[PDB]
Design a protein around this ligand. Structure first.
Ligand SMILES: [Ca+2]
Ligand SMILES: [Ca+2]
Ligand SMILES: [Ca+2]
Ligand SMILES: [Ca+2]
Ligand SMILES: [Ca+2]
Ligand SMILES: [Ca+2]
Ligand SMILES: [Ca+2]
Ligand SMILES: [Ca+2]
Ligand SMILES: [Ca+2]
Ligand SMILES: [Ca+2]
Ligand SMILES: [Zn+2]
Ligand SMILES: [Zn+2]
Ligand SMILES: [Zn+2]
Ligand SMILES: [Zn+2]
Lengths: 220, 215, 217, 217, 220, 215, 220, 220
């Protein structure tokens, strides 16, 4: 029956284009993530509401609310009633895994006559004292592709610092590079471990010289 | 037995040969098996290394049944400098962007972590249009350490070049401790190279790792 | 009327058959592949000229990583090499120390006897491996070498000793109390279990009395 | 619009590849062919139970015709067998009488010594073939057998003798004047040049002191 | 290019018939097993040569020949120099695994006026004393589909016995079935665990009343 | 690169498999190689001859994994007497009209010429339609003798039969000297049979010749 | 049946292209010879290991190692235990058969300001004293196509010398050509009789003026 | 050019039928042999002319005519001037090679009331004394398929005799078969070794009882 079978093909060829176009949609779908977006708003709002704990303290589960000193933030011993201060997701070492690279635009408004340029924070190394887990000590490389007299230049420096789970803060100070570089400071308050809000500051006053919103670079 | 059996005999015979044919095409392919070539050529190299140098310090040997020494600055430059052409027919870059190589330690007298392994990720690689003999690379040297007092991870980035001249990639010192990596390729392999960690200044070897291409 | 198209088709084929035979023929008139046992011997001979880091009393793992472990640790039941090469069968093969095993070559003396090149034969007479100490395969053998190529007299000294998995070396000495003859050292670093670089020594100082490259059988 | 017919053709193929792999797979899960060296041993073992006409001092040609010629005529340079089988290389192989050759098995004594099954090792120490009398390959060897399985003492008697191409038998006796030990007869009628049916005898009467089926190495 | 591509099919269709016919060959090939046949001859011949060990003894490896009492046949302790008396393949419990069924024709020539009928030995159970492994004790069911006065009848009985590795002998005696049944005796001398040579005999004299060659029934 | 390179890729792949296919079809044919079968089966026979007789004096063994003895008078008779069928599936006559067999002497204690060779030409062969178990033959036994006093040639004719029962052709005595030929076939060969010259009456063997089919 | 037969052709036409392409492969295969290459390495390595015999001596079979004076190298009388000093392959006269031609590039580094040119050694004649076989005496023609003042010139000369089996050395001295030509010297250490390693030298000191790797020219 | 080439075939197909029909002609041609026929007439006529030599004598070459006693007919020593009495073709042993079979119709007109039946003379053996070549001694089997009371019978007997080159006569006498059989006598006077003229006769008078013309049977 050459017709019903040779035509049942023009039917299949369709599914071929369909299945293909369908691939494109699954690609569009991965970009619009809900469970992620919602998290951005949660964090975005919690930032306004503000943890009900004093500076340098960790707020626990929205049900059994209670304050914990970040010296226990994530130390290995159940300190909160809900143990939220040891919940894996709070202490994902991956946020600042050695090799992670964060880029973004650094808009200056405080201590330098710089044109909106880009900064590239990249974690060099990361130790975690087995007898004091509450902190991830780390070294990193800060580069700044900015334009000066003439063409494209690169003002970079090596940094040392730490990551605090409690506040998801990453502090990077210059490795005594006597060239006077502004310590960078990032907070990963955005609902994920991919994006962070940073500022260049004076190690002393912590005065904010510039705003820098970084994003973790894709490895593909 | 006529237009039926005499037609299926001039067919069952067409195949009876189509077999003997591909049968040989196999035995042939078996002696051209490229995997055998490199594997053997690789062996040749090991020997070339034991023999007195074929050419001066800074010259490239073109091999063949009639040898010719040309400057290493000519290997893969775009000009046919060697009679045979070697200096220009094998210019494929092994460690190219995206590639990853896992090194297994076997002699470590200097690294700060005296690690068991050591991953070598190649971020970028670009060749200057006018100087083909050298390809510049950007690499991240990853390391998974773990002691009693702590547990560190590292991903030091470093610049480096690959010289088709002698299949040797030099990775400039990552940390300011005067320690750099120098892996010289087999010549025919490209999925495994011995990686020597040295003091750039001196050129002292103090760490050997066998790097395998993570495929 | 019908075979007019077939009578020739079978010919076009009877044709191919010939154009092919004249190929399969020109094929055989070409050197065959080399027995893997040959390449092995090359990789060996070669690997022996290459530089090696293992210091006396140590031999390198057979793995892909040339790690050095102490001789006293090969084939002892515990993975000592990074990859365990010190314990895989291809390393701990008893193939060499098998009872009755015999290796011979032409001994050419350079230091302890008139004798002009003669045949040397070191053959294994008995060998046990203490259950708790696998590192060594203690054994006994005999070393025989022709004396007078004419009347065929031949010296036969009994020996004692072991076989080192690490160095892949056979080390035998006289039993003590029998005319105090010679000893013998055979390295099987030649690639396989049938070829060795033996040297008749003087037990006392392991000083080379004569040398003979041996084969097995 | 164009690949609509190709996108699937490559599939019909990616198909065959699997229906075939699932075959080549079910293939390997099948016993391989037997090494010709095995069949040979069968044809031998068998041929040894079959009736044979050659009277003592005679052995049959290796040809297709089981003709019997006198032992004194094999490998003497003159075609004595109807077909010349008594002179083809596969018959006159010296493979057995090669210097250093060694055969061993487990000797189980039935007539001349307390000894409980122990390892016997008859190994060739030297052997020449007089230019004008090829029929025999005169040789010398050593017979060693373990004494005390515990302290590993071992007896080593020197022997003299020849190898008969016809009977394919190795016949050795003690050198005369050394504790008058034993002799040994080994038949290599087992099919190849590496297996033999040896029996430790008493030189004098060739009476079987013990028997041991041997292998070579 | 409709021709070179639409014709490259008449080329593939071929491989389809080929690959199929090839399946049939792989089926024919499984029937003609060499490594098996050779083994049949080995055993067949060894049977003529005869183990060089006295009755009730086990012959070890053709290299280090030596006799062992079948009370050690396969007891767990290395008794032979080559340890061939503990070699797994010698003591494959599977020969007489419970559930194995052996059938075959029983030709009678000694103690019964029976027409060539079939016997069906099927292993019921099988214990193996952990403190005495040298023997597999077992119960089995012996059936004999034979024709008598009229039509097809079935003369069966329950049996108890043992399997001896050393001789690969299987002895089955009647479970005191006072109906007087001839004990069956099988030897698996054929190079495999599939076929065996049996005989019906009087438990006393072991006199052979009949010849019975069984084969293990396929489970498909 | 489109309707050109994507069409020659779905072709160079069709063959890349058509090879792996016939490659196996070969390895298979290698285990079914009939020449291997007979050659091995032939070996089996030699053994069957050493083993105690499988069946009585005048009975035919059907072999297989389940043996059955039937009368030799039933082998190749037209009736399926054996469960397995052996008694009827192998009924091909080896020595058929036109065929010639050359015998090489190797033990002659009776022939009048004690000849080196002995040709055996089969003139005619006919099977009785109602008794298939025996095929009657007419044969000429040729002989090339040569002494000092003369040089003779002979071509004695004799009757004979071939019994599928045991693959044994009996050639009745040619000359009135009570000497006849009895060659028993391998069972699987048929291109070589041992030919015993015997005294019909006694059945005494006194001459053995290995006969090869002259092809 | 015009279709199954007229199509069974498109099947045969295939084998025609196949068989042809297959010819090309058999041509590629002849270039990559293994048993030859391996030999190159053997010799290549043996050259490093170095024969265990003193200069002017011949090393015998790797099994019955022993030294022989090259005055017996290949004299006709079995001198080595393995007779390897009479093994045909050692004394293949063909290495330097009259009429053989060797060409190659002569790179100069010692006694002449010559540009990398080519030399062409061609054997003129070759006698072999029947009462002294250990040496092949021979005459040959050495040509050197080199460029001088202006265009292509040719500096050639007649030579006399010998070939020594033991060392596979070929020595060619000038036939007193009072124009002062450098004697050529070749060793056929490469595992074959096709290629050789040569040097131009002063007959006195044998000092090496130049490196020359020759190859036997094909006769087709 | 599909036409001139596809038509050049209808031209070749012709040669195919031609070449075939031509085979048939080459078969017809082998039956009508001239050099043979002529020989038949020569002999046929020479028979009338009659050798110019007395009974029991051999006539030599038509050029150097001369008589020789058949005791030298073909003895190995040149007896005739032209040596025609040793000419190979005269003494072809093949005429009566052992194994040759001659058949033909035996018409009776002298000593038996037999119906025209057939006789089949077949040479059993043939010795030729190395010290007396002039004669081929031979044994043969004479069979006569004749019809008697009822159906087809066969009256055969063994014979002994000789062949004489000189006269190309073959005499076969009964091996004392006391059943009284008529000795057969053949002459190969016909120009070839294939056909002969025979007669059954009484060994005493040689009186002719019957005429028998035999022909050598083809072996295909
Ligand atoms: Ca805590
Ligand atoms: Ca260049
Ligand atoms: Ca270990
Ligand atoms: Ca000396
Ligand atoms: Ca001879
Ligand atoms: Ca005892
Ligand atoms: Ca046991
Ligand atoms: Ca039947
Ligand atoms: Ca010599
Ligand atoms: Ca004459
Ligand atoms: Zn900066
Ligand atoms: Zn029953
Ligand atoms: Zn010159
Ligand atoms: Zn008659």
């Amino acid at each position: 029956l050459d017709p019903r079978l040779g035509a049942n093909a023009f039917l299949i060829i369709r599914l071929d284009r369909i299945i293909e176009k369908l691939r494109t949609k699954l690609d569009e779908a991965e970009k619009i993530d809900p469970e992620h977006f919602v998290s951005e708003i949660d964090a975005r709002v919690t930032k306004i509401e503000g943890t009900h704990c004093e500076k340098r303290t960790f707020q626990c589960g929205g049900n059994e609310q209670e304050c914990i000193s970040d010296l226990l933030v994530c130390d290995g011993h159940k300190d909160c009633h809900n143990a939220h201060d040891e919940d894996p997701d709070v202490c994902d070492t991956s946020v600042v895994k050695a090799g992670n690279v964060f880029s973004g635009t650094s808009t200056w408004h405080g201590c330098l006559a710089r044109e909106d340029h880009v900064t590239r924070i990249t974690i060099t190394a990361s130790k975690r004292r087995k007898f004091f887990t509450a902190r991830i000590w780390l070294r990193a490389l800060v580069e700044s592709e900015l334009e000066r007299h003439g063409e494209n230049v690169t003002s970079s420096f090596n940094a040392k610092g730490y990551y605090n789970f409690a506040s998801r803060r990453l502090i990077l100070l210059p490795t005594d590079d006597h060239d006077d570089h502004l310590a960078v400071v990032c907070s990963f308050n955005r609902g994920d471990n991919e994006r962070a809000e940073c500022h260049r500051v004076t190690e002393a006053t912590l005065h904010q010289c510039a705003d820098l919103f970084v994003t973790l670079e894709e490895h593909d | 037995q006529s237009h039926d059996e005499i037609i299926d005999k001039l067919i069952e015979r067409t195949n009876k040969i189509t077999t003997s044919i591909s049968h040989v095409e196999s035995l042939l392919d078996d002696r051209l098996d490229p995997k055998r070539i490199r594997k053997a050529g690789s062996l040749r190299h090991r020997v070339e290394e034991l023999e007195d140098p074929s050419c001066d310090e800074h010259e490239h040997q073109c091999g063949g049944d009639d040898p010719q020494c040309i400057s290493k600055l000519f290997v893969c430059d775009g000009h046919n400098d060697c009679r045979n052409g070697e200096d220009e027919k094998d210019c494929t870059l092994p460690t190219k962007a995206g590639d990853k190589f896992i090194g297994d330690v076997c002699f470590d007298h200097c690294t700060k972590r005296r690690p068991e392994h050591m991953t070598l990720a190649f971020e970028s690689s670009s060749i200057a249009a006018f100087f083909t003999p050298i390809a510049d690379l950007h690499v991240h040297i990853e390391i998974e350490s773990e002691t009693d007092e702590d547990e560190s991870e590292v991903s030091m980035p470093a610049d480096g070049e690959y010289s088709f001249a002698d299949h040797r990639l030099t990775i400039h010192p990552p940390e300011e401790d005067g320690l750099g990596l120098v892996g010289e390729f087999d010549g025919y392999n490209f999925d495994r190279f011995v990686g020597h960690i040295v003091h750039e200044l001196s050129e002292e070897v103090c760490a050997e790792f066998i790097f395998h291409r993570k495929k | 009327r019908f075979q007019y198209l077939v009578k020739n088709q079978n010919l076009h084929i009877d044709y191919l058959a010939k154009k092919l035979h004249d190929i399969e023929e020109e094929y055989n008139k070409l050197t065959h592949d080399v027995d893997k046992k040959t390449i092995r011997q090359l990789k060996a001979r070669i690997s022996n000229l290459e530089e090696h880091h293992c210091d006396e009393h140590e031999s390198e793992c057979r793995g892909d990583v040339p790690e050095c472990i102490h001789d006293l640790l090969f084939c002892d039941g515990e993975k000592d090499c990074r990859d365990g090469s010190d314990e895989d069968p291809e390393t701990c093969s008893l193939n060499i120390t098998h009872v009755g095993s015999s290796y011979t070559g032409l001994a050419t003396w350079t230091s302890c006897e008139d004798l002009n090149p003669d045949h040397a034969i070191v053959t294994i007479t008995a060998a046990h491996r203490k259950s708790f100490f696998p590192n060594r395969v203690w054994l006994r053998a005999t070393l025989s070498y022709e004396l007078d190529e004419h009347d065929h007299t031949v010296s036969t000294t009994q020996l004692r000793g072991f076989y080192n998995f690490g160095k892949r070396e056979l080390l035998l000495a006289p039993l003590k109390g029998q005319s105090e003859g010679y000893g013998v050292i055979c390295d099987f670093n030649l690639g396989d279990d049938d070829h060795a670089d033996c040297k008749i020594v003087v037990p006392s100082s392991l000083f080379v009395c004569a040398h003979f490259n041996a084969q097995r059988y």
